[PDB]
Design a protein around this ligand. Structure first.
Ligand SMILES: Nc1ncnc2c1ncn2[C@@H]1O[C@H](COP(=O)(O)OP(=O)(O)OP(O)(O)=S)[C@@H](O)[C@H]1O
Ligand SMILES: Nc1ncnc2c1ncn2[C@@H]1O[C@H](COP(=O)(O)OP(=O)(O)OP(O)(O)=S)[C@@H](O)[C@H]1O
Ligand SMILES: Nc1ncnc2c1ncn2[C@@H]1O[C@H](COP(=O)(O)OP(=O)(O)OP(O)(O)=S)[C@@H](O)[C@H]1O
Ligand SMILES: Nc1ncnc2c1ncn2[C@@H]1O[C@H](COP(=O)(O)OP(=O)(O)OP(O)(O)=S)[C@@H](O)[C@H]1O
Ligand SMILES: Nc1ncnc2c1ncn2[C@@H]1O[C@H](COP(=O)(O)OP(=O)(O)OP(O)(O)=S)[C@@H](O)[C@H]1O
Lengths: 222, 49, 50, 222, 222, 221, 221
């Protein structure tokens, strides 16, 4: 239609062991669409989310991020692809030896930003997730559903064009999982697509978002 | 043409499935023609005599 | 049960009218043959009395 | 659109008791579509699946299978309609007195096939369902979710153009029910439509397939 | 498309306390559409259902009921807006001091109808809900899921153009909740839209109706 | 304790194929207890329910019904064991060519009863299930949820001391399944134990009854 | 009663931040009992499972493993406490640079075993989980549901007296989660207690096992 943010054509991903993680995945996602990527355990859910970030390269087909083809993206341009992609995993990748403030301020230092610029954005980002007045404590002494809230805060910093959630809230309570999902909806409202991959049954059943149902590497059925 | 081979196989395996009842029925069908046959023989032999 | 399954799968009306047709024809032929053999042996046994 | 495989127009089915099993059911199914037929107990779910196979004739309206109208299909042409339709019920209709090999090989003998032709296809069909090396045992000594796997194997033999599942996995475990559903998706991938009627809540809620919600004989609401 | 029965444009509702109940709600509903309005507790679900009846006026945007704009509907014309709207709440608003017959016959007396006209319609309306031979008893001695059935009977009287259900069956059993939903589907079949707002997970998951997912005042995501 | 209506010792059931259907299933049920028998598909849920009716004999262990041993019950005495057992299956075994009135009066004539006696009991039994004024019609004309209702009506005739249900409401709606379960409570109130074996998850989670979990032939635990 | 395998007195665990992770958790577990430890995220479910392994020491109260007190177990004796404990975590801790055969033979060589002895036990352990003929391949080549299966295989080597599971099947499908739970029953049958701590709702509702509810550090109730 317009400028499809994410677009697969005939993407396949066969690993060095000779087994098929994906087979003929074809879909596109509009700039603002929120979708769920469900499927069983052995289906290429996190494999699909890996190709978007450029962590892994497809064995066939093509991938279009924004307007640029990233099928054979050069290794020099990869770090600038992931700067527009927010990445949240099942577990937080927090650096537990360092304060939350700097642990959230990492992406701005990566891109290169003023010291005072960093102060303003991380304070705002720590406020949208509702975790201000927590910037001085270390990740170890925050509670379990509170470390993940920083992981979203780190991702949302630098205004990513897309959040890729790889089974978030997999080790979170049902009451906490809904809160995280209301957070993702908060970002999706303004301008940013979401591709939350998940296993939860009562989380996708309460929302009317597009569901992508991977099954042995085959992507969409409905 | 291959259809009339499962036909023969099924019919034969059905007749052999219950040999008790099968033998009983072929016996009682044998009786029902036996006497007509023998009475035709006593028809022809007295006709010749 | 086999007839019902065959009809459901899509067996024609002539497929079901077959094992039986051949079964009945074979049964009649075998019965007539056995009956004739028994009649012949019994008349030849009564030949001893005659 | 193209060549709608299944199409109802204003189909109604009133039985000899004078009660309405269906009333004005109108829908169509593309050649490859996978859909779920849900509804309460007294709704004409299995009645709808009966009209497609020609087991029952509508009291009104018309039914189109592939390109041919089968509303008043002649009794001579009915056996050739069901040869393109795979039928799976809640319980297996397996012939328990005969080996699984022949119990699966029945549809080819119905159509008329070479003895060696039968050997190849049933071996393949028993392999897609994953039940090879089981062809010599009788249906009685296979486990409960294993007899049903043959029933799908018998249906998938002769490459049916449509599988009609009448509440399969109704007497199966939740872990086994998902496995059967991944089997149906396996066939739907290549070329064959599926109209799985079901009661399960967590089976249709994990997939993004079209749902047909019968209610007192009225077919679609969403 | 045609004549959208309900249509919001950029509707917002800020209360005297200065908090946002809705923010930029935009949707339309065709004359016959059945939809579910889900969302968390603090989302403007019953606020959205209040604007349609004219109980509350939007702080911004416009609302179109049938073909007429009701954004600033004059207080003289409000009673004739609600006469086309059926209203069902979580709890019955039954007048417990008066017989069910008259408690159901109220809307006709409101509009002005013949005494014999009232007799015919309330008897029919008490029959569609299946609650005839109950017209002489008082609401107190009917069972819990039986008072609500009158509340639907009172609403369906006078043939409303739309039923607005505000979390009905919230204090009803799961077996009873499904029965009430089959009642709403019964009315939706003929000509009348439904906007059932609800919290139930297994009630909307068994049907294929449009789901509107309010979240902090933002209306649709899927 | 008192008189355990059903009691299993270290019991096992290996079929002709040499596979273990049950293994060491020990438990006891008081006269009035309602319990749920849950498990996966490969667990001997129906086999456990089959040993109680005498349909199958254990390969080991001992089974006591009421106060009598039925581990090696003679084929002469089985028909009187099944007269105190109500048997409800997933698929109703109603006789399709016979009216409901005669399809529910079968258990009475089995023991032998007067024509007036048969009329009174089946009419009461057909009213507890709520299917009265339906007895003259054939089972094919009833809905999928009333044919089962006749099945329980047939089981409860003759006042069995125990009701055995083999995954009932498996082909029934969730709204109907609760109604059938409320029927079995109506019976468990007075004098009949119930051993509902089921796969359902939202039917057994709304009650506080004893749950017997079978995993690969090993009970409870 | 007899010899309570795990017993907690009025126990508490306050971390260096001055916050209460546990508070007054008292319970006991028989040798053979299978129980579920449920709770919200802020409840010390993993902290409770950490005190049993000696990974963390209680700030108050007393903890008994088998018949011995381990409240203030010396750092010399901890490695022999963890040799009778099977530890399964949500995320498998498999060594990614080493084959499955050597990734499951680690517990055996810890205590010290013969090469023939190591071969026999790991082969049997890799067969109970059903992952035989897979031992020569690296964990990265297995699916997300078999890497965990090796994790239980590693835990069950050396025949631990207790299996502690910290939200296993959290990243596993519902079909796979039941299969893993059927594995833990296979072990709870013979001699090993299980303390499955999980968030799941349709895995613990299909069983009749003891449920230990933790709410803000307060157990059961
Ligand atoms: N090392 C630590 N330092 C400070 N607080 C901690 C530490 N470990 C845990 N906590 C706190 O202890 C409480 C409970 O911690 P946990 O035992 O991990 O609960 P849990 O989240 O149920 O365990 P899981 O999810 O199974 S890993 C939370 O408030 C944590 O913040
Ligand atoms: N007649 C039989 N011959 C051989 N194996 C059998 C027989 N009946 C049952 N089994 C096996 O016994 C095991 C358990 O059987 P069942 O008792 O039917 O379990 P079940 O499936 O829970 O019962 P249901 O579903 O309520 S009918 C399975 O492995 C079956 O294959
Ligand atoms: N009269 C009022 N004055 C001030 N704030 C109000 C008023 N009514 C509602 N609100 C607020 O409006 C927001 C959403 O409105 P509600 O109608 O309460 O939504 P709701 O609770 O989802 O609807 P129900 O009744 O639960 S179905 C909440 O933050 C309420 O506190
Ligand atoms: N042979 C029949 N004679 C009379 N009424 C029938 C017959 N078959 C079905 N009905 C009625 O038709 C209505 C719906 O048909 P059914 O096929 O029973 O629907 P269904 O029960 O949802 O399908 P299944 O088998 O449960 S998946 C019910 O009111 C039945 O009583
Ligand atoms: N590095 C790898 N080498 C070989 N096979 C792999 C590798 N990563 C994944 N696979 C296989 O790829 C298939 C699917 O990939 P996965 O990313 O594991 O899918 P997934 O498990 O659904 O994603 P998650 O992490 O659970 S959300 C499985 O058969 C895996 O075994």
């Amino acid at each position: 239609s317009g400028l499809v943010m994410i677009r697969f054509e005939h993407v396949s991903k066969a690993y060095l062991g000779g087994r098929q993680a994906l087979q003929g995945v074809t879909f596109h996602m509009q700039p603002g669409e929120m979708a769920f990527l469900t499927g069983h355990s052995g289906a290429g859910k996190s494999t699909l989310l890996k190709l978007i970030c450029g962590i892994e390269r497809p064995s066939a087909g093509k991938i279009w991020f924004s307007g640029h083809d990233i099928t054979r993206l050069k290794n020099r341009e990869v770090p600038f692809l992931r700067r527009q992609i927010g990445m949240i995993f099942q577990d937080h990748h927090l650096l537990m030896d360092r304060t939350v403030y700097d642990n959230v301020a990492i992406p701005l230092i990566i891109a290169g930003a003023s010291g005072d610029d960093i102060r303003r954005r991380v304070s705002a980002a720590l406020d949208k997730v509702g975790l201000l007045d927590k910037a001085k404590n270390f990740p170890i002494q925050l509670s379990g559903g509170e470390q993940q809230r920083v992981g979203i805060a780190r991702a949302v910093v630098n205004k990513p064009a897309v959040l890729l959630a790889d089974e978030p809230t997999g080790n979170l309570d049902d009451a906490l999982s809904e809160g995280i999902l209301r957070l993702f909806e908060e970002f999706n409202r303004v301008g940013v697509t979401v591709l939350m991959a998940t296993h939860d049954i009562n989380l996708i059943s309460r929302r009317s978002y597009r569901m992508l149902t991977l099954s042995d590497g085959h992507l969409h059925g409905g | 043409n291959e259809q009339v081979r499962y036909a023969f196989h099924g019919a034969l395996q059905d007749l052999k499935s219950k040999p008790f009842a099968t033998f009983l029925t072929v016996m009682v069908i044998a009786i029902s023609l036996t006497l007509p046959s023998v009475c035709y023989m006593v028809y022809k032999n007295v006709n010749q005599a | 049960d086999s007839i019902n399954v065959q009809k459901l799968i899509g067996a024609t009306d002539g497929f079901i009218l077959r094992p039986f047709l051949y079964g009945g024809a074979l049964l009649g032929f075998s019965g007539a043959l056995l009956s004739l053999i028994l009649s012949e042996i019994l008349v030849l046994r009564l030949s001893s009395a005659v």
